[PDB]
């Protein structure tokens, strides 16, 4: 087996087609299913896997109470084949309240963070064994992507942040070979706050669209040079911005370089990718809450500041339904690299108070060069039918 | 591994022998089992798999209420080794309220349809990745076989329909290579309505026996030429007709060419196959409801219009028990290709109203050249023992 | 992979050592576990599997009521790796209320009998496909070994009986190559009634120790010549007889040739094997009921009529606990063939009437050339703790 | 596949990083999970597995009552991939109330002890078959490591004891090749009582840190020469002793040679390993009970009698939480052999009497040459939420 290089052109897509749905919450009402959040998808050269951070409990279980909280020692990284719900036979791959995983063509890398808020540990597990670890450098919630890392020619890269959630933080980009950290680069460029990067291979480098939790409702961009380890960063050009919260479309802005200072505080993990001058992106339908999910192409959204002409919109989850995090993953085809995305469908607290837990299901779409119709694929559970 | 060509003669059979039974509904009364309908079977070169469309819920689960409905966003294609019940570790292969699957000798193809009735999307997944998609062409419930597609020399074919369920519709035959649609041929010939084809390899081509939901209780036949993509169609000759509803045997007719206009509206998915001038077929025992199931050979049933001489009858499910959809699948043996079939055993609504759900189990038989006895192999659940 | 020839000498054993226990009934009180009976064990060249006839239901399930009955259409052959309890993910390999399975070194053969008492069907499934079938020849409960068949050089043999349970019956020995019946030999010799043979390879032939349900509490022997298909039969010489019911040790007899007419009617499946002039055998401890289980070597038990000197006794299940069927299986070692056995531990009806079901667990022992101690390994469930 | 030689240098470590956690008890409150104790971890050349002794029952099950007891016939060795909780699909590998397992590079060896206290049997299972067995030599609870054995060049060694738990006993070191005992060496050296050895490869030999249940709160050391089968033994030099119970640090002693006679009776399974003159070790935080868990390096802890200079302490489980047994396992990396350890987290009786059962979960850490922070990773179940 050979290392992945991702050295094919990006598939020319017309939009996205339905790929997977796990129905986790509906099933939790009649079966033993893990409580999770922060899911993502990543594929080895043959097949795709779904990941999520468990809460060390199933849903119909008194331990599900108060699982809205982000970090406990019992959170572990769950990994199943895509479409297999997180049942009790699910393997816990490592201890983690923040994680990233990727396959370099030969084996899986998992980056797993756990421990005290002020002094966390990131473990690097490769081909089923612990190879390296690093401790918190800013003593303030060391944290990473919550989606797939990217490997080119045996070197994988992952973005990690330590420091304030609402101010200048310390972001670093790690380069990892067979689980061993070989280089660490500081963030450089004009992005002012970076969290939860959704990264994809863009040979010969890697590109990430992230979350600015401080001053921007426009999404930061991080560009990683795999050859000399140099880093650059900026903001997505599109005037149709990707974060939540954000201003409405008529009053949102981005200049490609700075956070827009428009309802910039807080945010949600999301994604986007460039195609020439244009941009494919997803976002919540609601500008204030994690409700609904839509994708579209912005004409000039990559190259033209404040561009707002969109086309090829698709509703993924209608605005009467809860969404959550979303992220990108890439899949190598015969002659091109396709882009896919997942969206987290969060149920329970804080939005739905009949129950005491917080969990999620997922829905997954992949780029297509063919044609498609319309629909909406929400979580689908009836909150009144759930164990509280 | 090589592409399948199915280039062996058809096995000479004397009837069918018991092969598999999953007992899904009996088990659902004491375990967490998926609610499903529209099951089918298909084998890779090594082993057989059972498929079905989940309802995004288990049976003992409040979400099982009102699962009689055909199309919701939460339906997904389930896939297990044949004989493994749909428990919570079952993989959901794609999002689908209509589907077909087949293995070309190298990898699995799944065709999965979901979304809005008037604007559905068909996804084509090959070797674990989304390769193509197509949108609705008549804006009226794009739909496909609900049984295995057939591949010869790396080209797979699947029959799809869009348009009226009770009038002229738009049926097309897709040719697919490694997940990519390479050609689409319109239906041609004298079949006037085509749904839910049960197809089998008949080298060098493919033959399908389908459901006419409009004017015929005789089953349409679709012949597919894999070399030039040409299509022909007609109706099964046998005067013992295969649809439900239908006239009783003394007053049923087929002329091989036209729908018989005998209780033609509505129908059920079924199968038949030719052996020279003769026909092997199955059908429900009841002529008006999906109750019981029988198989038999009709002498001259392939070649002689209105032939009604049967022999080698076998009861599969006695008429005091519910059946449902049925379909064919083919299995390559050492020197010949065998024909097998499955029967969907529907329990719950609308026929049994003590419970609020609709689900099924399955029973499976394979052609034999040996001898056999008699029996009946129904679902076997006691409706009074079930969670409602 | 090559066909098995079993052409190594038999292991010299000093007794048996603990190998496996599944604890099915204890687990059934807190988990979804199949109701089964008539288990057995068989190994491919790499690993062992446990088999049993399911009753189409789990134990904590209203359908478990009245599972004391032997034959219903919902019984299927279950197959797991040895030591994996029959949970809901268990594969049902075929439809069967009587079965036998074996691996020829290349693939599995399953012989599965189901259908009407007076007209049953045996299906032969090889390498995952139905290859042959045969119908009842005496119209009276066609039935087979309920333990492993034996294959030498690609030809597998299995013993089947059709006819009276309490009088002359029609026993036949089938020879099967890759699932295809190639020859059928009538029983010959002096055994007067043959059921439920426990067979083992004894190169160049196969030897079976069976159950006489008519006139003998001494066990019949069937010898199968794999080269010319000839059959011989007689009775185990040992004066310590293996069936239940039977006379006490002081008044039991066997002459090697005829049924002993000592509490001969009824019986239980059991096993024995020869070592030179001596005999290793197991049996219930109770002479009248399926209670307890013991193994020992009878000096001259193979060659000397009415021999009663035993040595190397081991209690497997003490007499205060229920047992049931037992059978032999053989395992190829580096330089010899080992013999192992399982015993079925029956719980519920008819002996324990607090509950309405009948099920079993298993315990498994293997021949050893080493040393060992003592113990008792019964089912271990508390009938008062069970769902009724 | 080749035999393991473990012929690489030991990894230089700075401490330990989080590796795995199974959350067994939390999950048991909402799912069917095995009752277990005496867990351990061992890896084949590709991946790691978790083992434990089941109690033949799930936790939410009336049979979980009184599972504090050490030895019943229903205990079996469970084996899952590391991180997969012991659900109902878990394989029971053999019958055992004491065990050890290891992989020699080609196949798994399991050593399984069961039966009567005064006459137990040890079974040796290699590559899925029973190869050897040995009976009790002192008629007083034959028992072994409860952690991984170690194989070099096709010879596996395991430490077994028979005799008094509180006085002179009979300890022997077995040498095993493909499951067959080829040599047995008596314990030699100055260790006066040996139980539950935690062994690791230290090419060309094997080293074990054990439990003295009689006179020492310092841990015995056993050195095994794999070339001539010679044995040596002594006690860990460190004045910071590893057993529980023990004296406080100010008044604890070890002279490297004799048991210290400081709260020597009783004990708990634990581990340590050498790095030059220094010692890495773990122990409960409490000196009297199985509460808390800490690791640290003792400068001169291997070579300097009574050394008490520690550095690089890490809390693994804070002292407000229950621990239990702990043990070492070794993982071969690209250029070195790493050392890892697991901690058993015991819940229920005798410490927590709200419930009537005794079970455990596990947490697992691996050596790292990188950096790390702080935390505590206890079982995490709320005893008040548990089925009693
Ligand atoms: C059947 O399905 C197809 C495919 O999904 C669908 O065609 C699509 O329709 C949408 C909506 O009209 C198109 O996307 C739009 O493109 C225009 C530019 O041409 C944009 O202006 C639109 O954005 C505005 O309107 C949106 C609401 O529709 C707002 O949310 C947004 O803020 C803007 O105000 C939007 O991007 C899309 O291009 C086509 N896709 C293709 C491939 O043609 C079709 O309509 C469906 N038919 C029915 C009747 O369901
Ligand atoms: C033991 O099992 C065997 C094998 O299943 C069984 O033999 C079969 O019997 C049936 C019924 O007699 C045969 O099928 C019939 O064939 C005749 C032509 O020879 C047809 O006329 C029959 O059709 C008419 O009758 C049917 C009801 O039986 C009606 O439903 C139908 O509409 C027609 O009116 C029917 O097809 C079959 O050929 C044999 N099979 C073989 C291989 O011989 C046997 O009877 C069983 N024995 C017992 C006592 O159970
Ligand atoms: C520790 O375990 C060992 C191994 O299990 C055990 O040694 C065995 O003891 C039994 C019982 O004494 C021996 O089997 C006996 O052999 C004699 C002939 O030498 C027979 O006469 C015995 O049969 C008679 O007695 C039986 C009851 O014991 C009756 O059931 C039977 O009907 C006969 O009347 C019996 O076969 C066996 O040979 C040894 N095994 C070996 C290898 O030595 C030992 O006793 C155990 N120690 C203790 C004290 O538990
Ligand atoms: C963030 O995490 C890091 C890494 O875990 C942590 O650094 C570690 O701190 C501990 C505690 O200070 C160090 O271990 C100590 O080393 C000294 C020798 O230098 C020993 O004397 C200590 O033992 C004494 O004190 C213990 C209590 O701390 C007693 O239990 C013991 O009996 C002795 O009296 C102890 O071994 C360790 O070396 C460092 N690790 C590294 C690699 O630097 C750091 O403190 C954390 N920061 C915060 C604010 O949480
Ligand atoms: C399944 O859902 C149905 C429909 O919601 C439930 O029956 C309804 O109950 C409401 C309120 O009690 C009535 O007003 C409706 O008339 C009922 N609908 C029908 C068509 O009868 C039913 O209770 C649910 N079943 C279960 C087991 O919860
Ligand atoms: C198992 O089934 C039997 C038979 O139905 C049940 O026993 C019967 O219960 C019915 C219904 O109340 C009574 O009318 C009969 O008198 C009973 N028959 C006998 C033979 O006593 C039994 O209750 C069922 N067991 C369980 C646990 O449901
Ligand atoms: C677990 O088993 C114990 C022992 O049988 C049960 O406690 C006993 O209950 C009996 C009957 O009331 C008393 O007479 C004994 O004194 C109790 N034993 C002890 C040690 O207290 C207990 O009820 C069982 N637990 C559960 C949850 O069923
Ligand atoms: C603390 O909040 C951060 C993360 O935010 C959220 C959320 O749903 O918004 C979920 C995460 N949950 C987990 N990954 N477990 C957080 N991240 C962490 C490390 O808590 C945020 O990005 C600010 O730094
Ligand atoms: C709408 O009815 C169609 C299908 O019919 C039925 C039925 O049990 O008859 C089940 C399917 N259920 C699913 N495949 N989910 C339907 N087909 C669809 C696509 O709904 C029919 O063939 C007429 O067009
Ligand atoms: C009818 O009884 C026969 C079989 O006996 C028994 C038993 O526990 O004794 C279990 C079987 N149960 C199943 N195998 N299912 C039977 N065999 C059959 C075919 O019923 C007996 O050997 C006489 O013929
Ligand atoms: C009897 O106690 C021994 C073992 O003790 C412990 C314990 O938690 O301390 C658990 C074991 N439980 C199991 N291994 N099942 C015991 N060992 C046995 C064989 O009982 C001890 O080391 C003294 O000899
Ligand atoms: C869940 O925990 C909360 C907070 O501690 C408490 O207020 C509430 O009563 C609990 N709810 C349930 C369902 O037990
Ligand atoms: Ca923001
Ligand atoms: Ca019709
Ligand atoms: Ca008898
Ligand atoms: Ca001690």
**Element holding C25 (H helix, E strand):** helix C24-28
Which has the closest alpha carbon to C152: C366, C342, C2, C327? C2
Rounded distance between C-alpha atoms, residue A235 and residue A254, angstroms: 7
Cross-strand bridge partners of residue A223: A207, A232
**Element holding A282 (H helix, E strand):** strand A278-283
Q: Is D70 on the interface with C (CB under 8 A)?
A: no
**With an 8 Å Cβ cutoff, are B130 and A23 in contact?**
no
Cross-strand bridge partners of residue B133: B123
Instruction: Using alpha carbons, list the distances in angstroms from residue D383 to A64, A365, A366, C23, D324.
Output: 14, 42, 45, 27, 17
Of the CA atoms within 13 Å of residue D42, those in its CB half-sphere come to 29
| Cβ–Cβ < 8 Å for D79, C82 | no
Q: Kindly report the backbone phi and psi dihedral angles of residue D26, in degrees, each rounded to the nearest multiple of 5, phi listed first.
A: -55, -45
Chain B CB contacts of A17 under 8 Å are 121, 123, 130, 133
Distance of CA B196 to the CA centre of its chain: 6
Which has the closest alpha carbon to A358: A30, A76, A35? A35
Rounded distance between C-alpha atoms, residue B263 and residue B243, angstroms: 9
Rounded distance between C-alpha atoms, residue A73 and residue A66, angstroms: 14
Which has the closest alpha carbon to A211: A196, A226, A232? A196
Rounded distance between C-alpha atoms, residue A133 and residue A138, angstroms: 16
Exposure string over A90-117, b if 16+ CB within 10 A, otherwise e: bbbbbbbbbbbbbbbbbbbbbbbbbbbe
Residue of D22, D27, D48 lying closest to A58 (CB–CB)? D27
Is D70 known to be catalytic?
Answer: yes
List residues near ligand 5 (CB under 6 A). Answer: B 65-66, 356, 388
Determine which residue's CA is closest to atom 10 belonging to ligand 11.
D70
Cross-strand bridge partners of residue D252: none
Q: Is B323 on the interface with A (CB under 8 A)?
A: no
Q: Is D123 on the interface with C (CB under 8 A)?
A: yes
For each of the domains in chain D, give its residue range(s) and CATH number, in order of start.
Answer: 1-388 (2.120.10.10)
Hey, what's the torsion of the CAs at D6, D8, D9, D13, to 10 degrees? -80
- Read out DSSP for D209-229? EEE-SSS-SSPEEEEE-TTT-
Which has the closest alpha carbon to C171: C181, C161, C158, C163? C161
Whether D51 lines ligand 11, by a CB cut-off of 6 Å, is no
Q: Is A112 on the interface with D (CB under 8 A)?
A: yes
| Cβ–Cβ < 8 Å for A182, A190 | no
Q: Enumerate residues 6+ apart whose C-beta is below 8 A from B305.
A: B237, B239, B254, B255, B256
**With an 8 Å Cβ cutoff, are B375 and C134 in contact?**
no
Which token pair is A316?
Answer: 């993924």
Hey, what's the torsion of the CAs at C86, C89, C92, C97, to 10 degrees? 30
- How long, in residues, is chain C? 388
At residue A141, the 3 state secondary structure works out as: coil
Which token pair is D290?
Answer: 């199985």
Contacting partners of chain D (3+ CB pairs under 8 A): A, C
- DSSP letter at A218 equals S
Is D200 known to be catalytic?
Answer: no
Rounded distance between C-alpha atoms, residue A353 and residue C163, angstroms: 67
Residue of C35, C121, C172 to mutate, testing the B interface (most B Cβ within 10 Å of its Cβ): C121
Q: Kindly report the backbone phi and psi dihedral angles of residue B39, in degrees, each rounded to the nearest multiple of 5, phi listed first.
A: -75, 165
**With an 8 Å Cβ cutoff, are A133 and D372 in contact?**
yes
| Cβ–Cβ < 8 Å for C110, C94 | yes
| Cβ–Cβ < 8 Å for A260, A246 | no
Cross-strand bridge partners of residue B363: B21, B343
Alpha helix ranges (H) inside chain B: 24-28
| Ligand that comes closest to the CA of residue C37 | 10
Cross-strand bridge partners of residue C125: C110, C130
- DSSP letter at D10 equals B
Cis peptide leading into residue A245 (ω within 30°): yes
> Strand C205-211 vs strand D358-368: parallel, antiparallel, or unpaired?
unpaired
Selecting among A44, A60, A70, A318, the annotated active-site residue is: A70
Distance of CA C213 to the CA centre of its chain: 15
Of the CA atoms within 13 Å of residue D7, those in its CB half-sphere come to 6
């Amino acid at each position: 087996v050979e290392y992945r290089n991702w050295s094919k052109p990006q598939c020319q897509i017309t939009g996205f087609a339905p790929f997977s749905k796990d129905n986790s919450i509906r099933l939790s009402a009649g079966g033993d299913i893990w409580v999770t959040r922060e899911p993502y998808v990543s594929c080895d050269p043959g097949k795709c896997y779904q990941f999520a951070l468990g809460q060390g409990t199933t849903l119909d279980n008194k331990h599900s109470n108060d699982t809205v909280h982000d970090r406990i020692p019992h959170r572990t990284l769950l990994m199943n084949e895509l479409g297999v719900p997180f049942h009790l036979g699910t393997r816990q791959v490592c201890i983690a309240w923040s994680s990233s995983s990727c396959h370099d063509g030969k084996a899986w890398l998992h980056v797993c963070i756990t421990g005290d808020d002020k002094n966390a540990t990131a473990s690097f597990i490769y081909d089923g064994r612990l190879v390296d670890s690093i401790g918190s450098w800013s003593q303030n919630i060391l944290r990473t992507q919550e989606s797939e890392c990217v490997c080119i020619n045996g070197t994988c890269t992952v973005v990690m942040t330590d420091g304030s959630a609402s101010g200048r933080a310390d972001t670093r980009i790690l380069f990892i070979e067979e689980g061993k950290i070989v280089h660490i680069s500081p963030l450089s460029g004009s992005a002012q706050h970076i969290e939860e990067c959704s990264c994809y291979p863009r040979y010969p480098g890697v590109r990430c669209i992230c979350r600015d939790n401080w001053k921007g409702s426009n999404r930061p961009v991080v560009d990683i040079n795999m050859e000399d380890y140099s880093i650059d960063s900026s903001y997505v050009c599109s005037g149709l911005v990707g974060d939540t919260p954000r201003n409405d479309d008529s009053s949102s802005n981005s200049n490609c370089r700075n956070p827009n200072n428009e309802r910039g505080t807080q945010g949600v993990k999301g994604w986007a990718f460039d195609n020439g001058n244009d941009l494919w992106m997803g976002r919540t339908i609601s500008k204030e809450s994690r409700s609904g999910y839509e994708t579209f192409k912005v004409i000039g959204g990559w190259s033209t500041p404040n561009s707002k002409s969109q086309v090829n919109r698709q509703v993924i989850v209608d605005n009467n339904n809860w969404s959550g995090y979303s992220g990108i993953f890439s899949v190598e085809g015969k002659s091109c690299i396709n882009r896919c995305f997942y969206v987290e469908l969060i149920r329970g607290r804080p939005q739905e108070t009949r129950v005491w837990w917080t969990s999620n299901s997922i829905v997954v779409f992949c780029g297509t060069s063919g044609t498609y119709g319309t629909g909406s694929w929400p979580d689908g559970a009836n909150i009144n039918f759930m164990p509280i």
